[PDB]
Amino acid sequence: LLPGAEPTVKNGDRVEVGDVLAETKLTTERGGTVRMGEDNGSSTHREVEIIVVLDTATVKAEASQGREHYVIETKGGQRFNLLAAPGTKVTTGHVVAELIDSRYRTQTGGLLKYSGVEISKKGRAKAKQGYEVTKGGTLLWIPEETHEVNKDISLLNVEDGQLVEAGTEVVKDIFCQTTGIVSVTQNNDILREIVIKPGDVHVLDDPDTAAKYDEGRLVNAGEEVFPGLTAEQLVWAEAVDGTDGPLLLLRPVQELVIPDEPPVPSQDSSQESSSRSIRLRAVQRLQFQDGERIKSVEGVDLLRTQLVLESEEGSSQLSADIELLPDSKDPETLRLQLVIIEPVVIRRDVASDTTHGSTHTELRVKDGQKVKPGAVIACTQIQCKEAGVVRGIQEGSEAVRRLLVERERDCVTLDLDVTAATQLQPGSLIVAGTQLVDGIIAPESGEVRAIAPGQLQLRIARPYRVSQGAVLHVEDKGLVQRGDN
Amino acid sequence: YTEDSIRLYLQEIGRIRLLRADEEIELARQIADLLALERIRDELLEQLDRLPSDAEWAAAVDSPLDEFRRRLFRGRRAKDKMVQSNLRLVVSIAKKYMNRGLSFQDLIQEGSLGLIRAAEKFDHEKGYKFSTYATWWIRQAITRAIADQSRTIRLPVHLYETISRIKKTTKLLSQEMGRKPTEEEIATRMEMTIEKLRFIAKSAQLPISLETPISRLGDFIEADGETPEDE
Amino acid sequence: ELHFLGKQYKLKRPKYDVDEAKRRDGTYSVQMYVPTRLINKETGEIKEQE
DNA sequence: TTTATCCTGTTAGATGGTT
DNA sequence: ACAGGATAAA
């Protein structure tokens, strides 16, 4: 009997050929929806899968530069790029898709300011993954171009505070990309950091105005920066020391408004039988903290909108495969889907001396059915090759590993006189060649089954002598096959 | 307590932290100061026909003996650190020829000489990373060492270059004509006589060891001498 | 990236012959040619060849 | 005359092994 | 690896 197999009969049950002796029951651990594998040349499904589903979008696989990238078009017209490939298993929290956005992509580096925008404060390690926004607001972006080098002084071409145009070789083999004022950092005759910041420059005549702008300040559109000078649009006004002394710089501040909740339509799970629902939550993450002074020659992405796998509490350890479902109404239109597939493996039927009986596995469910946890999925029944009597199955605390079937050809009948053979009892052990009655000698050894008038039933048996001190590999009333020690 | 020697050298190397560019510039300035001081001393050696004493050398720089000696020390230590922290670069370059005639440890020690020369000729004013200039010298030292220490019957560098050009020409002709070129074709393309080509081919061979199984080769070679019969 | 489409390796017919190789003291062999494709990860130019 | 042999230098960046 | 230059040995 296979591990976990449970006999269906008791000792002494007279069974026929093909009848069930033992069974193995496979049950679903957690329940869900049944998924039957297609008949790939087999009429017996060797595996059945356990499954929630989400569909209310559109997906198209487009090839760019030889790479197959999946574009998720929402019903609102928004577009997402699928960062996770088909066949990949991802746990809760992992990013699945990225919003295809360019509005929040800067041209160069700079400084970042928050206005009412709020973020979640959970975890520093997620800094590389950004900061989840808890409330929308306004991002103020102050442009600048920073060339970070560790080169010697005598390679410098431009003066500290020189007003330059883009393209000038500020440092040998280094070319500015922004038209602005150059501010130079050096340490012990070593060029360390060069800064080019756009914005209008103007003369600082009154020390009091400079003292107001000592730390730099924001100035709105139309508000007079200083008498005779009104900012046409929101600008950052700061006092800088150029070649001739004080100057006022009006760097153009950009404004990026972020809504409180990402207005990208979520797609809802459609199956209630899953007590642990799985969904895609859209989140907004800012990759830099408030006031984070960023130094980058090329543009950076500030805000990322990411689809994230979310599941109910207690299902955090579940990992979901990612699949494409062809729509029933339109097979061409595919829809992204996440499944927490649980496998159940069905062994092929073997009737050839493995269990020495035919093992036949029957499913207890149908494709697409809804099953509760613990429900029986498959029953494997072992069918006996030869009729007889079932014995050797002991009771209590131990798994039935082997059973015995005594058949019709394991019993022989002999013609012996009852009258004087009264010395024998049903179940006696008869050594062959022993004089059972006067003039009557045992032809074959065996166990005494029955004593009929003029007849005797012997179940075939054979002894083995064992002397004192031997080592016993077996137990009383055990079960042994051919060749066992 | 490992028995491997290369692993021990790699451990000894890993006990040294890589330099930064500013550190490279500082060390390059101190190295240049040391080089100039050495040049001066060499001038004193030509004038004195003897090694100048530290007092005479300090006098040649109009420097107090203590200041001069400390400057000399700083320069020595600067060059030492510049070489020491780049030995990892030496190993990284030397690992790319570990099957050419020199053992890996020989490649490392020969590239160390190139690194020392590179650290002696690095110019901070050029405005380049030391890992770019040093690579040329390390590669040159290793290539020269292979050319001069890989064979028992050493061949000159021009012969290695000739063999390389012969291989390249042969491959080019095979690609152009779609077949293996003949000796005369190669000789004409190389503009050299066929006898010279055969001589190059014969001199390029590696010497076979006397203990090659045949039983060893050395037991099948007769000896030079006059046969007892011929005397 | 170099891809070796090794399922399509063709074989060139043997030069000389079995008897010619035997009498010439040469080798009886063929030449193996596999199709390959060099793919540039960005430009995307693929120079297919054998 | 004409090579055969030796010497010095090279500026993107690179920085601990295979069998 | 490759280019330039100095020289002596064939």
From Swiss-Prot, chain A:
It comes from the Bacteria. DNA-dependent RNA polymerase catalyzes the transcription of DNA into RNA using the four ribonucleoside triphosphates as substrates. In cyanobacteria the RNAP catalytic core is composed of 2 alpha, 1 beta, 1 beta', 1 gamma and 1 omega subunit. When a sigma factor is associated with the core the holoenzyme is formed, which can initiate transcription. Belongs to the RNA polymerase beta' chain family. RpoC2 subfamily. This is DNA-directed RNA polymerase subunit beta'. The chain holds residues 490 to 977 of 1318 of the full protein.
UniProtKB/Swiss-Prot annotation, chain B:
One of its GO terms (biological process) is DNA-templated transcription initiation. Residues 161-231 are annotated as: Sigma-70 factor domain-3. Residues 82-152 are annotated as: Sigma-70 factor domain-2. It is found in: Cytoplasm. The keyword Metal-binding does not apply. Keywords: Cytoplasm, DNA-binding, Sigma factor, Transcription, Transcription regulation. Its main location: cytoplasm. A motif (Interaction with polymerase core subunit RpoC) lies at residues 106-109. GO terms for molecular function: DNA binding; sigma factor activity. One of its GO terms (cellular component) is cytoplasm. Sigma factors are initiation factors that promote the attachment of RNA polymerase to specific initiation sites and are then released. This sigma factor is the primary sigma factor during exponential growth. Belongs to the sigma-70 factor family. RpoD/SigA subfamily. Interacts transiently with the RNA polymerase catalytic core. This is RNA polymerase sigma factor SigA1. It comes from Synechococcus elongatus (strain ATCC 33912 / PCC 7942 / FACHB-805). The lineage of its organism: Bacteria, Bacillati, Cyanobacteriota, Cyanophyceae, Synechococcales.
From Swiss-Prot, chain C:
Signal peptide: none annotated. Belongs to the RNA polymerase beta chain family. DNA-dependent RNA polymerase catalyzes the transcription of DNA into RNA using the four ribonucleoside triphosphates as substrates. In cyanobacteria the RNAP catalytic core is composed of 2 alpha, 1 beta, 1 beta', 1 gamma and 1 omega subunit. When a sigma factor is associated with the core the holoenzyme is formed, which can initiate transcription. This is DNA-directed RNA polymerase subunit beta. It comes from Synechococcus elongatus (strain ATCC 33912 / PCC 7942 / FACHB-805).
